[PDB]
Amino acid sequence: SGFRKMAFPSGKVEGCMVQVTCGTTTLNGLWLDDTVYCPRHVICTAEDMLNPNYEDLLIRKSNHSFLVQAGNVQLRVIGHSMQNCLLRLKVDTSNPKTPKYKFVRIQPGQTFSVLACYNGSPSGVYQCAMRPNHTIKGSFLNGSCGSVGFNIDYDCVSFCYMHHMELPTGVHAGTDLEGKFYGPFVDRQTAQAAGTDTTITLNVLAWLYAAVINGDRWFLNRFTTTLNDFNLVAMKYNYEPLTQDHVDILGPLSAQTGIAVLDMCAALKELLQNGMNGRTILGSTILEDEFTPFDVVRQCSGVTFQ
Amino acid sequence: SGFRKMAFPSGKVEGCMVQVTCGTTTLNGLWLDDTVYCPRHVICTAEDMLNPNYEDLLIRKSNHSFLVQAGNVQLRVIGHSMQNCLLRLKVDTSNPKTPKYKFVRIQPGQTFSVLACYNGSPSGVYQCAMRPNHTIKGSFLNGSCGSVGFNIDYDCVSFCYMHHMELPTGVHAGTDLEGKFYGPFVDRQTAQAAGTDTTITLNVLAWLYAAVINGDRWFLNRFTTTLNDFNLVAMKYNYEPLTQDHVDILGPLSAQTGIAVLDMCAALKELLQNGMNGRTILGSTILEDEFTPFDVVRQCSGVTFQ
Ligand SMILES: *[C@@H](C(=O)N(CCC(N)=O)NC(=O)[C@H](Cc1ccccc1)NC(=O)[C@H](CC(C)C)NC(=O)OCc1ccccc1)[C@H](O)C(=O)OCC
Ligand SMILES: *[C@@H](C(=O)N(CCC(N)=O)NC(=O)[C@H](Cc1ccccc1)NC(=O)[C@H](CC(C)C)NC(=O)OCc1ccccc1)[C@H](O)C(=O)OCC
């Protein structure tokens, strides 16, 4: 019993973290096989963070311009290239600790674990969701660029995020492991802002199923709704529209709890309209939107507490 | 910027997790040097979970009654003993991956990371606090007994919890790594209940400092309070009393933000008395009590966003 945001155990990714230094800049990198990946802004200098031209900043770099440090050991750089907003440095050595891994591009509303690192040294791990506005609400201080986000299935690490920037509202922006940003952001210190965000409807509904699977039914009601009517109320509250795909995704949870998805929507549409005020759901006031239906299945019992 | 519950990276503890089987029971253990530690209830049988006599259940066990499995490898058991509510099994082998470690007995209000494991296989990590009523609000399903809680400073793992039981309210109970329970609980399936819990005042105040360090001042006020007057209001709301020790602990945060602790108490005493209703603090409605002043210092910037 219990329901907690939880991260994947971080050990397979700790054995991949290194420190990359170019000049007086040090930031984190990710060593997998014989390659180190890191934000290309490692090559910026203090005086040009506004409009760096990376292609031009890089052609002035050689292999011995980069030092890669793994533990107390120095990795020799034997080639480099840029890929989108990342650099790929070839090192002497293949990392004995490389796990099975994939690189994947996570989709808004999905969740992943962040391993926050400074100077190549892991300091903490936490779960977060890719927001609909393509930023994440992370927790990162100076030196965290290069920290990665990932998910793990069986023995395989699916890397999905490398950290790059913080935006004025204190939320965070970064790229996939091919160096393509999430969202419209760019790796320069020019004014950028997160676009308005929206609540992730699919996740809020999932988390209502988890509350029920765990034993709470208080927020239910005897009413049903049309997808279309629900979506009218969602607009008003700044929720993403619910699509039939989202409804189908929620099938297994609906089946385990015996509550039809559109009955759960009417319950949400009543929480939205009438408030919670006085009562929590799984320890929370505020409808929580950072758990996927997959995260609820992974973590809850397969047997409903009826 | 940002503020997130975060766990310590879990890799050093993943390399310590094994599976211990006695009969048809399998649960997790913790291998450190040449010893495996696990809940003694691994020796219970289906028909006596109410009143097992462990001393008598154990004298009927030999070394070859236990199988210890590390990865695909079998560890031979070469001696065993009981210690309080744990067994210590000596294995053939010293674990090559033992980190520097200590065993410590965490104190109520402190926080630690739990690595949830099933069958010796880590599945997730999350942060939780030792509640004043000596249970933790964890998230654990059948097979999680033996999962551990820990903190890490530098290279050293301080183990503080091994999981044993779930109580009817869905909260959790367990022991230190010397096998002494936290709280008045016992390792048998006889009726037990968590005592009434209380909110952890020191942590709520810490988290008000973190909100300020991050840049929010909304809940402040022009008023001050007496420790004693604050405590009157704390009783009414079911908060632990605030002691001068707690006040001294909060000094560094007070100094970084320039808000006197007793001014922060008056602000809390006004949140308590007037509600939050409409506004959040670091993303939360509900005053959060699962971050220590040490966890806020570890995670926030050292420079206040004034
Ligand atoms: C890199 C690092 O630690 N971080 C993470 C910061 C954090 N708290 O998450 N990354 C950076 O600091 C960015 C460095 C940079 C990136 C591209 C090009 C040049 C430099 N910069 C920022 O994240 C910056 C804010 C910092 C807190 C100052 N963000 C923006 O400028 O966003 C755009 C913007 C919006 C509004 C007004 C102005 C700008 C680590 O710092 C490092 O090694 O840096 C080397 C460059
Ligand atoms: C051990 C295991 O996975 N867990 C963790 C359970 C969880 N979800 O956290 N531990 C147990 O299940 C306990 C097993 C046990 C302990 C001592 C002696 C004999 C057996 N039992 C419980 O935790 C049990 C509840 C279970 C969900 C059934 N708790 C209590 O009975 O609490 C006291 C009580 C209160 C009110 C009424 C009755 C009892 C894993 O299950 C294993 O290997 O078990 C081997 C014994």
UniProtKB/Swiss-Prot annotation, chains A, B:
It catalyses: TSAVLQ-|-SGFRK-NH2 and SGVTFQ-|-GKFKK the two peptides corresponding to the two self-cleavage sites of the SARS 3C-like proteinase are the two most reactive peptide substrates. The enzyme exhibits a strong preference for substrates containing Gln at P1 position and Leu at P2 position. It is found in: Host cytoplasm; Host Golgi apparatus. Cleaves the C-terminus of replicase polyprotein at 11 sites. Recognizes substrates containing the core sequence [ILMVF]-Q-|-[SGACN]. May cleave human NLRP1 in lung epithelial cells, thereby activating the NLRP1 inflammasome pathway. Also able to bind an ADP-ribose-1''-phosphate (ADRP). May cleave host ATP6V1G1 thereby modifying host vacuoles intracellular pH. The chain holds residues 3241 to 3546 of 7073 of the full protein. Residues 1-306 form the Peptidase C30 domain. Changing residue 189 to P: In strain: Isolate BJ02. The active site is at 41 (for 3cl-pro activity), 145 (for 3cl-pro activity). This is 3C-like proteinase nsp5. Monomer. Homodimer. Only the homodimer shows catalytic activity. Residues 1-306 are cytoplasmic. The lineage of its organism: Viruses, Riboviria, Orthornavirae, Pisuviricota, Pisoniviricetes. It comes from Severe acute respiratory syndrome coronavirus.
